[PDB]
């Protein structure tokens, strides 16, 4: 079944025969028996092909090679035995192969390597021995053959490298030793490797820095990442000045010598992370071909003023997670395309810091203490796409030089109350601003080939043009405010001014009138604010919510509502007491206590942070999750509570059953107030539950409709459905006529 290519090359992989194929041409020069099921090669198995030149025995469960089996293969050059079950390197089986160039013995379960092994292999060039179970480096077999050029010993159980282990491999070029359990390296373990150009020590147990690598003058690639090493001392690479790449990541490092990375002329990258005991910039004299630089998580507070003028080919510069507070002048470097200064202590950006960086594309200044940026800091800076100054304390932001900026991030700068004109950022695609009102003028109706995405959204609780919204909601709010104000004033004047004796019920009615008047004053505040800023509210919300006016409006609203509810409960208690059968002074004291409680409830959100500024309505019931959950849940809890106690009380006298009249007035008051409180509580609770989805515009409209409505309604009922008021009005008219 062997597939013959006809070019003196034979393929026999995978057809499952357990012996050497027979009947093959005598002139063949390549033969493949991989994937087969050959376990042992009998004596003189390959004597039929004296012209063989490449042989592959991989995948076979082969675990024995006769000493004379591979004899007579003088012209063989490549021999692979990978994946097999050879328990030891075959010493007295490859002895006669005097013209072999490459030998694979990797992925076998090799435990021991006979000392006499590898004798006579005067033409070997590459050796594979990785993924084996060798406990120590075989010194004699390696010393046997001096012509080796590549060697790998990875994925093994070697723990220490003895002195002069590789003394005689003068021609070695590549040495792999990664994925091992090496933790101790002798001072002379790497002697004689004059031509070595690649050393791999990754994934080991090294804790102290290897002193041996000082004897590798031709080193070009060195890797020791994912080790235990912590200290890299000065003179680490002094003996190997041809280094190009060094891999040292995934290593817990504390201190790196100041002269560790000097005189490496062709080193092109440098990444150091976690070296927490470093406090000064490395001596980089002699290192001029650096393309990248990454010093992260250290205590460096300065950057050399000659870094830009030395590294001509610098392309990336990462200096985050340090204590850098003063920046040098970057004008020297032209190829620099990314700069990261994230999470540092920089407090100022001057116009000279970024002058002349003609190729800078990405700039990061997130999470620093910058409070002043020069107006022309980015003026002559070249074509930049990404800018990031998030989580600083910025008061103003420059405009010139940022027209071709695709991305901008300004979040976290709560003092940045200005507005960014969309004329400057004609090509911006993604924006982040501290306040949602700043992105209103930017995206317009989008949030004409704009596709501009702004991080803080304006979901009708941060209005762009009109605060109240549709015309009908503006008219009804205006009407509510007018009627509430006028009728509350009229009720107060009739009840209090024209009187000589104040019964408890009448005084309570007057107090509810006062609270409703305060609610109406809040509604008038809202109406005038909307009217003044009509179609331009995006220029007002930042000043409104983060100002004293919103605090005033929120306090007025909360105080009026709480006072009305508490006075409604006190009236329900007095009605019960009057129906039971002086205490008028006691009830006056109780009314003062209720007023004080309403005042303290209103004042409470002032010291707490993040409630009165949630919405331009200055209410503690905004859209979405309430930032101060506790305050809102308490307020609604104790409101529904007092509602249920007065409901229970009036149920009690209903069961129990002039003075008999006017009780229905208080009943209607409790009816209207409770049925108007339910929607506000329901739509404050709704955003907490993810099951119910409510459009924010409808929520805001209904809140604006029903929050102040009881203030509009109560004096209407007192003024039209109570003969008590008609008598008071007659008395007032009689007093006026006098």
């Amino acid at each position: 079944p062997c597939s013959c290519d006809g070019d003196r090359r034979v393929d026999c992989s995978g057809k499952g025969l357990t012996a050497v194929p027979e009947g093959l041409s005598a002139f063949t020069q390549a033969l493949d028996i991989s994937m087969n099921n050959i376990t042992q090669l009998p004596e003189d198995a390959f004597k039929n092909f004296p012209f063989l030149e490449e042989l592959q025995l991989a995948g076979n469960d082969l675990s024995f090679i006769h000493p004379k089996a591979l004899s007579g293969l003088k012209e063989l050059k490549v021999l692979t035995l990978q994946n097999n079950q050879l328990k030891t390197v075959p010493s007295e089986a490859i002895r006669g192969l005097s013209a072999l160039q490459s030998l694979r013995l990797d992925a076998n379960h090799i435990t021991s390597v006979p000392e006499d092994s590898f004798e006579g292999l005067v033409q070997l060039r590459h050796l594979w021995l990785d993924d084996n179970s060798l406990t120590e480096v075989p010194v004699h077999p390696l010393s046997n053959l001096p012509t080796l050029q590549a060697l790998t010993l990875a994925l093994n159980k070697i723990s220490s490298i003895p002195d002069f282990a590789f003394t005689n491999l003068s021609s070695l070029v590549v040495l792999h030793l990664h994925n091992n359990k090496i933790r101790s390296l002798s001072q002379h373990c790497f002697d004689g490797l004059d031509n070595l150009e690649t050393l791999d020590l990754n994934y080991n147990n090294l804790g102290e820095f290897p002193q041996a690598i000082k004897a590798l003058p031709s080193l070009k690639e060195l890797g020791f990442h994912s080790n235990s090493i912590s200290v890299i001392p000065d003179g680490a690479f002094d003996g190997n000045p041809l280094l190009r790449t060094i891999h040292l990541y995934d290593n817990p490092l504390s201190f790196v010598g100041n002269s560790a990375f000097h005189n490496l002329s062709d080193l092109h990258s440098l990444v150091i992370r976690g070296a927490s005991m470093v406090q000064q910039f490395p001596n980089l004299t002699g290192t001029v071909h650096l393309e990248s630089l990454t010093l992260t998580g250290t205590k460096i507070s300065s950057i050399p003023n000659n870094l830009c003028q030395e590294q001509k080919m610098l392309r990336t510069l990462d200096l985050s997670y340090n204590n850098i507070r003063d920046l040098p002048s970057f004008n020297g470097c032209h190829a620099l395309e990314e700069i990261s200064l994230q999470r540092n202590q920089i407090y100022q950006i001057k116009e000279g810091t970024f002058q002349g960086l003609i190729s800078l594309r990405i700039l990061d200044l997130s999470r620093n203490l910058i409070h002043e940026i020069h107006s022309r800091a980015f003026a002559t800076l070249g074509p930049i796409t990404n800018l990031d100054v998030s989580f600083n304390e910025l008061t103003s932001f420059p405009t010139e030089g940022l027209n071709g900026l695709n991305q901008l991030k300004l979040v976290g700068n709560f003092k940045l109350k200005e507005a960014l004109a969309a004329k400057d950022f004609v090509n911006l695609r993604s924006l982040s601003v501290p306040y949602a009102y700043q992105c209103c003028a930017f995206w317009g109706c989008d949030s004409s080939q704009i596709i501009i995405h702004c991080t803080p959204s304006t979901g009708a609780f941060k209005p762009c043009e009109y605060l109240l919204g549709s015309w009908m909601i503006r008219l009804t709010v205006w009407f509510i405010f007018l009627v509430a104000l006028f009728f509350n004033l009229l009720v107060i004047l009739t009840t209090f001014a024209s009187c000589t004796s104040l019964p408890s019920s009448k005084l309570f009615i007057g107090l509810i009138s006062v609270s409703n008047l305060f609610m109406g004053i809040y509604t008038g505040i809202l109406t005038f604010l909307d009217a003044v800023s009509w179609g331009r509210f995006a220029e007002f919300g930042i000043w409104w919510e983060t100002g004293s006016g919103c605090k005033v409006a929120g306090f007025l609203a909360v105080f009026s509502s709480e006072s009305a509810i508490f006075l409604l409960m006190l009236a329900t208690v007095e009605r019960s007491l009057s129906a039971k059968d002086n205490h008028l002074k006691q009830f006056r004291v109780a009314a003062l206590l209720a007023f004080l409680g309403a005042t303290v409830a209103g004042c409470f959100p002032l010291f707490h942070r993040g409630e009165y500024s949630a919405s331009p309505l200055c209410l503690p019931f905004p859209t979405g999750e309430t930032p101060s959950l506790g305050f809102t849940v308490t307020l609604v809890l104790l409101n529904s509570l007092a509602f249920l106690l007065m409901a229970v009380i009036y149920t009690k006298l209903y069961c129990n059953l002039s003075q008999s009249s006017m009780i229905k007035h208080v009943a209607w008051l409790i009816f209207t107030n409770c049925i108007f409180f339910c929607p506000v509580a329901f739509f404050s609770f709704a955003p907490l539950i993810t099951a119910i989805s409510i459009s924010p515009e409808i929520m805001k409209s209904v809140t604006l409709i029903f929050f102040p409505l009881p203030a509009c309604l109560n004096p209407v009922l007192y003024v039209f459905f109570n003969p008590k008021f008609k008598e008071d009005w007659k008395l007032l008219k009689r007093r006026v006529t006098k």
Partner: nanobody
Framework: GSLRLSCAAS????????MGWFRQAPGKAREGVAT???????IYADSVKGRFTISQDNAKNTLYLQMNSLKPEDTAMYYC???????????????????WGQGTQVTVSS
């Protein structure tokens, strides 16, 4: 029971260096049951002491191995291996020995 396993030198004497006896299970690796080095030094594996003994002699250059305490699991393909190129140290693996015999197969009895 007990049985005699004798392996002799076909040509030039093989006693000048280490000679041993190996056993191979059907289809897997040859494993070494015993070995003897010049000067009479002998090495046995884990399941060999007390039930297998080996001795050379250079009088007529021949190895011999008394086997006893017969167990069912200890039935395999037995070979005698030799090495006369000197150097190195004696061992228990197959790779070291330069010469190999055709071997004898014995089945456990009683």
């Amino acid at each position: 029971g007990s049985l005699r396993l004798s392996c002799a030198a076909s040509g030039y004497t093989y006693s000048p260096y280490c000679m041993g006896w190996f056993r191979q299970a059907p289809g897997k690796a040859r494993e070494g049951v015993a070995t003897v080095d010049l000067d009479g030094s002998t090495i046995y594996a884990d399941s060999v002491k007390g039930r297998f003994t080996i001795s050379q002699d250079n009088a007529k250059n021949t190895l011999y191995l008394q086997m006893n305490s017969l167990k069912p699991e200890d039935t395999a393909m037995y070979y005698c291996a030799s090495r006369t190129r000197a150097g190195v140290t004696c061992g228990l693996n197959w790779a070291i020995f330069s010469y190999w015999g055709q071997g004898t197969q014995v089945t456990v009895s009683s």
